[PDB]
Design a binder for this molecule. Structure first.
Ligand SMILES: *[C@@H]1O[C@H](CO)[C@@H](O)[C@H](O)[C@H]1NC(C)=O
Lengths: 198, 213, 220
């Protein structure tokens, strides 16, 4: 069971590795990456990896190696750099009762794994029954360093019915270790005296 | 800045022995130290990183130790190609700072200076100057005295001396001494003598010549 | 096999700007690692000037903070160092080095010497030193080369274009009156000279001069 440490993009986090060695020539070390310089502060029984302004490059598998009297040990930890900005867009921007579909798109997001990034279409708090997700469509968008993603989910709308809901809400949920983040974007539903006279 | 104080400034050791020099940082640096080797005249080469890591391709004779603010480079089984200046660098905070260095000299058998003397070339004498050059090659130790004589009288001023770095093969030193005279006062004397005083012999090693003769 | 080699003017006038180039080959300066500039003053004191990282970010030494600028050119795989308002106390040998938490300052350039001075560039006078008339025979014979009155450093002295690397002793330059003087000796077997030709080759890049002076026996 490989541990998983989540850190938001641009955030900071300290990973610490200790070694119980009562001998001489005891060393413990985080395997430094060619993308850092001075990120590791080691001693003889403890080593602290430091991540400031976390980028996607610092993301990956980090290994902590220890030696105790000519005896080497290693323990792995998965470092996860996630980005979950408040950038949701909806197509169409507004809904009309009778419409067959609605699309939500989360921008500049990662990870995109379904087990992490889930979409739900809410009405007045909870999920709108009668909906039907039509499978996510993950797309890599171009933001130079580094590769982020644009996931889009589409629903098959049910008959909204009467009374007409004030609006539907697209919710993007991201599940992380011991943490759930969510974002919502409003999809107003136009109804009734829409265009009227005098 | 973080001040890196390493000692000693220099040390002499015999072929095959084991030596160490320390580096003391003004504050704790969590093993974020590099040891650099600089052969005389040439560039650097990073031997050790993060205190105790041996860069691949570097002999196991080298090893680093320490933590907090005190680190030591330790060379064992000293070979002929280990005679250099050694620096420590810290990179745990900006700016990255270096140590003063540690010149590592090699001990060997005392050697006699092979002396050669050279009168002013024909070409130099046409311009208006005159230099008498005396080469003292492959001797040990580095400390050696040179004395110039013209017609028996010792000439002090007008003498420039330059020592080479320790030859990384035979472990010996070499030196040149140049006596600079005017063409006039050069063609007015007959005898030019270059004599070395080294601990390898109580009797000075003498080279000389006579102008034209 | 990663290689770094510095390059740039060896002489720079006070107040002007000093620019050097590091041509990196064998690894892409965008793939990873931090690319540093270090200088070594006469007397062998070292100082880190700054670096530019793989991602293009910079970080400089506060003591030089206003004047330093480390830019790059990903196309040619070069990175550069510029220093402004240069005084004489910037005279030093400038090195470039690639460092990171996996290697730790493992690769360096050959180093380039930059002198700051308002003095004129002067080519060396090269004098061939031939053995003394008469004297005594030897299994070996020593020839010399006097390289006098040049500025600035450095000069490059080889014998027979480098073919003769054994038995050669080149001495450190020395300053008299704002001009450098340097000597070099070479020892060969007595049957070799003057049977074969021994040439002293002096190169002074600052003045773009190459002197190839041949050592000849003396005449009375
Ligand atoms: C964080 O790093 C990015 C580049 O990776 C840079 O654009 C940004 O300015 C940095 N922010 C801080 C606080 O250093």
């Amino acid at each position: 069971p490989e541990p998983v440490v989540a850190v938001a993009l641009g955030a900071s986090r300290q990973l610490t590795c200790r070694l119980a060695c009562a001998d001489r020539g005891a060393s413990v070390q985080w395997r430094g990456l060619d993308t850092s310089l001075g990120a590791v502060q080691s001693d003889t029984g403890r080593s602290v990896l430091t991540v400031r302004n976390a980028s996607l490059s610092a993301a990956g598998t980090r290994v902590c190696v220890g030696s105790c009297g000519g005896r080497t040990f290693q323990h792995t930890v998965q470092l996860l750099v996630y980005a979950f900005p408040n950038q949701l867009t909806v197509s169409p921007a507004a809904l009309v009762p009778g419409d067959p579909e609605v699309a939500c798109t989360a921008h500049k997001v990662t990870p995109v794994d379904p087990n992490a990034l889930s979409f739900s279409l809410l009405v007045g708090g909870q999920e709108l029954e009668g909906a039907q997700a039509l499978g996510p469509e993950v797309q890599q968008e171009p933001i130079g360093g580094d590769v982020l993603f644009r996931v889009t989910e589409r629903w098959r709308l049910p008959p909204l019915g009467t009374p007409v809901p004030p609006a539907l809400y697209c919710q993007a949920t991201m599940r992380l270790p011991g943490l759930e983040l969510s974002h919502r974007q409003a999809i107003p539903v136009l109804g009734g005296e829409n265009l009227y006279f005098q | 800045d973080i001040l890196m104080t390493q000692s000693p400034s220099s040390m002499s050791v015999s072929l095959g022995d084991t030596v160490s020099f320390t580096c003391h940082a003004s504050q704790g640096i969590g093993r974020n130290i590099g040891w650099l080797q600089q052969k005389p005249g040439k560039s650097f080469k990073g031997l050790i990183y993060h205190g105790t890591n041996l860069k691949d391709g570097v002999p196991s004779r080298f090893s680093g130790s320490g933590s907090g603010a005190d680190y030591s480079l330790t060379i064992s089984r000293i070979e002929s190609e280990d005679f250099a200046d050694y620096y420590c660098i810290q990179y745990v905070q900006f700016p990255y700072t270096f140590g003063g260095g540690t010149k590592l000299e090699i001990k060997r058998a005392d050697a006699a200076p092979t002396v050669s003397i050279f009168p002013p070339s024909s070409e130099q004498l046409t311009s208006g100057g005159a230099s008498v050059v005396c080469f003292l090659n492959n001797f040990y130790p580095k400390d050696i005295n040179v004395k110039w004589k013209i017609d028996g009288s010792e000439r002090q001023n007008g003498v420039l001396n330059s020592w080479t770095d320790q030859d990384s093969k035979d472990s010996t030193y070499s030196m040149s001494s140049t006596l600079t005279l005017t063409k006039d006062e050069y063609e007015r004397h007959n005898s030019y003598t270059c004599e070395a005083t080294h601990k390898t012999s109580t009797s000075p090693i003498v080279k000389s010549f006579n102008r034209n003769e | 096999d990663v290689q770094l080699q510095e390059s740039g003017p060896g002489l720079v006038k006070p107040s002007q700007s000093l620019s050097l180039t590091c041509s990196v080959t064998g690894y892409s300066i965008t793939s990873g690692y931090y690319w540093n500039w270090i200088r070594q003053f006469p007397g062998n004191k070292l100082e880190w000037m700054g670096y530019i990282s793989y991602d293009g970010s910079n970080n400089y030494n506060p003591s030089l903070k206003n004047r330093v600028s480390i830019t790059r050119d990903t196309s040619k795989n070069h990175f550069f160092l510029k220093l402004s308002s240069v005084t004489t106390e910037d005279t030093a040998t400038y090195y470039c080095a690639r460092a990171s938490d996996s290697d730790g300052f493992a690769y360096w350039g050959q180093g380039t010497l930059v002198t700051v001075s308002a003095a004129k560039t002067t080519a060396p006078s090269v004098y061939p030193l031939a053995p003394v008339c008469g004297g005594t025979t030897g299994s070996s014979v020593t020839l010399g080369c006097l390289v006098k009155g040049y500025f600035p450093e450095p000069v490059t002295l080889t014998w027979n274009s480098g073919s003769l690397s054994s038995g050669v002793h080149t001495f450190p330059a020395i300053l008299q009156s704002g001009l450098y003087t340097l000597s070099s000796s070479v020892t060969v077997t007595s049957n070799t000279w003057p049977s074969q030709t021994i040439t002293c080759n002096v190169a002074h890049p600052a003045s773009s001069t190459k002197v190839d002076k041949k050592i000849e026996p003396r005449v009375p």
